[PDB]
Amino acid sequence: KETAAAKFERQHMDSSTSAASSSNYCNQMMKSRNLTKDRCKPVNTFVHESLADVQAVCSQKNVACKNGQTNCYQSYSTMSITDCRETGSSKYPNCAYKTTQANKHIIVACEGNPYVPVHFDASV
Ligand SMILES: Nc1ncnc2c1ncn2[C@@H]1O[C@H](COP(=O)(O)O)[C@@H](O)[C@H]1O
Numbered sequence: 001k002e003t004a005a006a007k008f009e010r011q012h013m014d015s016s017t018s019a020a021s022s023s024n025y026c027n028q029m030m031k032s033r034n035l036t037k038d039r040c041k042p043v044n045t046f047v048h049e050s051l052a053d054v055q056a057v058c059s060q061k062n063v064a065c066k067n068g069q070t071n072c073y074q075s076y077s078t079m080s081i082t083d084c085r086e087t088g089s090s091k092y093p094n095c096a097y098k099t100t101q102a103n104k105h106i107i108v109a110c111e112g113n114p115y116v117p118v119h120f121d122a123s124v
């Protein structure tokens with residue numbers, strides 16, 4: 001079973017580019033990270049900083065998670081991210097996403113040893 005830490009990297013980590021190059025980044029990334037598998041994952045964010053920078057958020061600003069747990073952390077700095085959101089028109093298995101480049105603070109939930117992000121809670 002893929003660990004939560006590994007799933008996070010699959011779903012949300014893309015250190016390759018430092019931002020979304022093309023307008024159909026989301027279409028490719030959502031496919032290649034297996035997020036369009038049995039359905040279209042409607043919303044997903046990709047983060048474009050080093051794994052080490054993202055992992056480090058786990059020792060930054062402690063905040064409540066949406067689900068009300070206390071193991072969430074907000075990045076001190078803004079980060080290069082990309083919001084993928086399914087278009088009004090999209091339909092499985094032809095999944096369609098708008099790509100939006102952004103610089104925002106990320107909020108992640110951290111777990112395990114080592115203490116690393118396991119959930120992407122929000123960007124702000
Ligand atoms: N570690 C986590 N911290 C906060 N919310 C989570 C976590 N894992 C999953 N969730 C989010 O909550 C949903 C499942 O409910 P729960 O994990 O119990 O809060 C998932 O669809 C996620 O959006």
